[model samples]
Target: EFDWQDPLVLEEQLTTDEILIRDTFRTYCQERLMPRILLANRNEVFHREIISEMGELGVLGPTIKGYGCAGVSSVAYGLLARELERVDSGYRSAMSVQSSLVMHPIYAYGSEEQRQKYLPQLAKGELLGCFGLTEPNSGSDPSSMETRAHYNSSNKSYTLNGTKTWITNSPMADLFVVWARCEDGCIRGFLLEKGMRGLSAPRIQGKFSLRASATGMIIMDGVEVPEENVLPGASSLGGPFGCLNNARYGIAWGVLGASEFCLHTARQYALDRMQFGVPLARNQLIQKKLADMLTEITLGLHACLQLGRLKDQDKAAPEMVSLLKRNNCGKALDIARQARDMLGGNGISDEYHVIRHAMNLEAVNTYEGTHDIHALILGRAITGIQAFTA
Candidate 1:
């Protein structure tokens, strides 16, 4: 008999610990978190069970500490993100924003009391959070955000007034790290609790992307924010930029799951589906397509992990992160579309994984940052030129 238990690939060569964490999370996602994908996609709704179960698995804040967090190595953390995303990109994004973007910033930049109050509950999925940055006219240009925060020294509160558009998990978030301009012309972050006097999240209608997760508009008018609620040390727009870097880092690793979902679906299609007398896989043209795709996947996997290591060592720059966000998101989405095409008529059907990955990636590519915007960012980084001067 063939030795079935022997390893198929020695993935341990990368990092034994990373691979173990990857496999463990992979198994956990398959066992507990995988079921919610299709239903959520079709109905355009979030799966609360999977969200909470993911938290129970330490998927959220997997790399944070002292909050029932795993605090795993960066590589392991990214790999977990990748595998979870492979199940469904939206699902992965939920945990990612919760941990890296929302929770991590609070832990890293928030006061000691903030950490003690939020991390454990957030880690356990007792509270859900979202970031508020992009505004109605400020998708790529955050500096233009009309959202304003006014300080009332007498009351020791910040009056938040503005609208934030295209925010993920907005309608359902318990807390929002909202950014607005202070009277002093400075961008600041304030923790606005849900159901404040003038805060509201109306479900944004008619979205063609990120359908399975909640996407809505935040309306904060005359909302009173305690001075203590503003992130004290954050000085400028760069504060949200810091949070974005962490979010983009997870997205860099996360997009590869789209690539894998595409490639794996295409490979399976090629092997099983027959054209004329032969399987699609046997076609030299299909072989070429797969050859090119796997080459990208191989490189992407390496690049994604390398980025994680760089982040841990504090060696990675924002431009480096931007490059990966641009390339992997752009390429993986393309791969997903092409992979869907490889399945021809079946690709468009909701039953298949290819089209869903393709559809979901539409949001992934645009949000976090737009493709062209990121390109200009890299262009600036590479040439020391600022092209956004309009």
Candidate 2:
């Protein structure tokens, strides 16, 4: 059974600190990001300065402790994601790439010196970074990546050669956390600084999705990385998967923000819109749509809070992250489409915002483990049998 109520009412269930953090992020995103997001999307211009602004808010690595990080609770971090994504997924994607994909790997897998050298600057947004894991031929089958890192035993350096495509935050990144197969056929992560010999990031244009975010290719043509630059704790594909799970958790929470925004926009439109000399919201069909959206949003919010608690306790599993990311993204896309329909002709306009969300959700459904990929993940868990063929 589902009960439809005000989404804000759920805030009562949160801790005092959680509520404070949520409110702070919501206000900040509204003031700073909301104004520029529409124009940014229309123009397809992503300003690099946004990273520094988010960093100054201590949002770049909210869950990581020390070294200029925010060190907030997992719930707080989720709240921040929800707020940022409420404005634009591209904004949230930048934050996710920084916190989950980039900062997380270095802190969790790099040497102590590596942590001190990179985490602080990354946390402060003084340095921007991208995670290079997915290759053109290895989007879902990460194990099949052809990128190679050959070790030079004499000079203690690794010569990396590969192309990482569809990378978020790549074009303007100051550093890249690149993963490649080593001599032993085990996957490993290496840090490649910008302007390194033979390393180039060429922007991938014509993106209809995440247009406000920098997405590009990392072309590593025999880029030399000193042995010391390799992430010591990152050996095998598990290292990159660990980073992915972190970002997947963020996506679970982030999609709900888009859902809420859609619901709010549609509800307001219904109320003001008139047909047959009566408000459209007075119609049962409109009410049903509003009710359905509210119910799912409420459910997604509860799931996030519980999942966040588990993550904070270190008890959350990758399967659990898969469940939320799959479920929330699918539903949010549906909600956005519905909201767009409710707006009628105005829905397609950039001024309405629902059309933009609807388009962005299409990409969201595909990335961070596609809809079908996550379903298989859950299938394998329930049946105790591997189902993935690719």
Candidate 3:
């Protein structure tokens, strides 16, 4: 039997361990996460318990070794992201921030003491973290960031003063990996814990996308961070970009899950829907739409798999990640829109699920470098001309 869901039998490519991880997460998302997602999306509520549940499942920071992590392969990491996104991009976004942006930096750039202090708790979901890179005045051009970290030689502390906007999980974050332009004119990463003397993370509401995920702003007013909290390895923009690359890679694989869900839902709807005494599936136009969606999804999945293998080998270039993020996110958004259209009047309803995915895909397309931004990056690579300015 041709399983419409697994049209290309991608599941067969997985190892036993990978399959177990995938099936476990698949069941978790379908049963535990799915039931609350619709209401959560509708109410713009973020379930904090879900984080601990994922921690228990050993999904958070699964790619990192030790510190109570699973040390899973890159493909397995992608599979975890895929299942989470299969429920909602918001869910995947939360995990990506925890695993990639937060834990990865602490493990990769932080000192041994920093890692030992934070990684175990973060892995266990006892502590949540957020990355603060995008500021109110800076989006793509982080070099122009206005946030400043003045080094206080007398006290051996850096007084951070700035605001970071659009921070995921910020309001609830117990730790913050903040980037600031130091007094030496070099960008540096700082670890700021919650309840610091002049720090606050206020939730940003009134969002039309990714509402199920908590988005907020990080406000720093003379926030004094000890010298030991600085990430010694991340002395420049490369640090944050490295973390973003990991998150973007996950987004590449994650959106495919969203596309698959949209495809499955639309396919089932087409078969069950009746118009003019015939199922919508019998219509040539509807069939073409479904076929096109499946084809794109298969291509995206293959690309993700190859990229995952390269990443595990440390051979995956940032440009390759940019391509995957650009292609998959753009395609996923298109697939969601088509799936929404296929649902006809029912598409606009949140109960149908496609519409919610469609709305969330909008944010997914815009964040972690918009589709056009990635195209410009690739273009720069091809032509050797930086087109970001002028």
Per-candidate TM equals 0.95, 0.97, 0.98
Error of 1 at 78 (Å): 1.0
User: Lowest lDDT 10-mer window, candidate 3?
Assistant: 3-12
Top of the candidates by TM-score: 3
Q: Write the per-residue lDDT of candidate 3 for residues 306-336, one digit (tens) a residue.
A: 9999999999999999999999999999999
Which 10 successive residues of model 1 have the least lDDT summed?
Answer: 1-10
- Backbone clashes for every candidate come to 0, 0, 0
- Tens digits of per-residue lDDT for model 1, 172-260: 89988898988988887888889789999988877656677788888997899987788876777788888888888788888887788
Top lDDT prediction, candidate number: 3
Model 2, span 230-252: residue lDDT tens: 99997788999999999999999
TM-score preference between candidates 1 and 3, better one: 3
Ranked by lDDT from best down, the candidates are 3, 2, 1
| lDDT, model 3 | 0.93
Model 1: how far is 332 from its true place, Å?
Answer: 0.2
Query: Model 3 segments beyond 4 Å from truth?
Result: none
lDDT of the candidates, in the order given: 0.82, 0.91, 0.93
